[PDB]
Subunit: 181 residues, 3 copies
């Protein structure tokens, strides 16, 4: 089992009841909060910078989460910071960005260096959020580049917590199957 | 652990199915005869069922999933894929229906409830919106995917030629023992 | 360990100090130059045609590199040829194309059959380079389909070698961790 890998003396720190599929790859300076889930063939690579993920957040199949090293081309680099109750859809590409709490990241979407996604935002599937772009709390964004479509509805606001909740129940089923061992 | 039982349900594999040892298939998934699932593809039939027809390829890095039934999506969305379908590399299929003799372009995305009819081409990189029905005999391209042109006779023949080529190719990969 | 696989009597040829993550999959008729690096969950499938990659080139997480077999639909097929100091971003999709030296291929970009990317070109993240498209040296290309945006800057010119060199150093660290075994 080499899904959770120590890198230069730094071991990923996992909260309680974290699911990491045996086929996922997590490396180095990464923290995941309680009840997080990392699904088949996802990569979370915290080698050249740090990665911090909150509680009850899913990183779905085929997603890649990475960072940008500090250099003269990017002074200070770009770590990756992700909040609680975030649903990261299949095949997402998250790079050096900041994501708040209660956020839906659509499958196949891409969030780039220095981008900031505020609380309670929906990023539609396939969207591209450009470097340094700020997504305003309470809105749906769509397209390449991602543009504000409309405010979220009350049903959608509810879904942030319910949907993350469903993935918590699901990862508990996968944990019961022993898919992380 | 490329073919995993989930809550007592084991994937059902037809005759001569190739599943690369690096792919991940979970739960309520049925694959027809001569299907192939290529390196690092995921077919996750946990919250709903997935059915794939005969002579269909699911190429490298593709992810196939479904939507669970709730008040938000009453009944949910299973994933149904027909025969002689070529699902290109890094495709994203979610709770949709695909007919027979269909090309799904590499890096394309087919969303919940969409239906691709027989003999359709979805161009590489295209996104087929939720609920959209793609008309038989046409090429769809773009984000969002739009009808661009009718397929050509040579393209029509390619559905079958190409699926056949992948059948012969997966037999070579099986012969190398890549599924074990 | 089945990351580097013989196929129909042909084994991948690896140069000096090459890193292949244990979770990547390399098949058949593939050659990698000195100091190349292939990152978690990448696929390089040289079954129906040849794939050649030069020195100090990275193939990043979740990328898929493949080719097109020779047939009446594609006379002679399309092999995959990649030069030195090429940075292939996460989740790239390279199919049957030719890529020169000192090239940045953005994450999630797609380069298709018969495309030719000249030396010192930047392909922006998420771009699709159409089949047969020629990318002229010294320019930035962006979009779907990819179009010329502007010439590269001097800092961008220097980054091809800097960035590739940074990945050579990074892969030595990953080798030191034994991630390829």
């Amino acid at each position: 089992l080499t899904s959770v890998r120590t890198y230069q003396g730094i071991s990923p720190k996992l909260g309680e009841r974290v699911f990491v599929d045996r086929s996922s790859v997590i490396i180095g300076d990464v923290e995941l909060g309680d009840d997080c889930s990392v699904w088949p063939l996802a990569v979370i690579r915290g080698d050249m910078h740090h990665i911090r993920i909150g509680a009850r957040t899913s990183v779905q199949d085929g997603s890649v989460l990475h960072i940008t090293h500090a250099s003269d081309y990017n002074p200070g680099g770009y770590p990756l910071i992700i909040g609680d109750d975030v649903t990261i859809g299949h095949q997402a590409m998250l790079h050096g960005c900041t994501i708040g709490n209660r956020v839906l990241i659509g499958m196949k979407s891409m969030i780039m260096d220095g981008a900031i996604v505020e609380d309670e935002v929906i990023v539609a599937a396939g969207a591209t959020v450009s470097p340094g772009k700020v997504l305003e709390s309470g809105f749906v964004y769509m397209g390449t580049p991602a543009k504000k479509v409309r405010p979220i509805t009350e049903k959608e606001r509810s879904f942030f917590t319910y949907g993350a909740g469903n993935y918590v129940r699901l990862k508990d089923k996968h944990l019961a199957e022993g898919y992380d061992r």
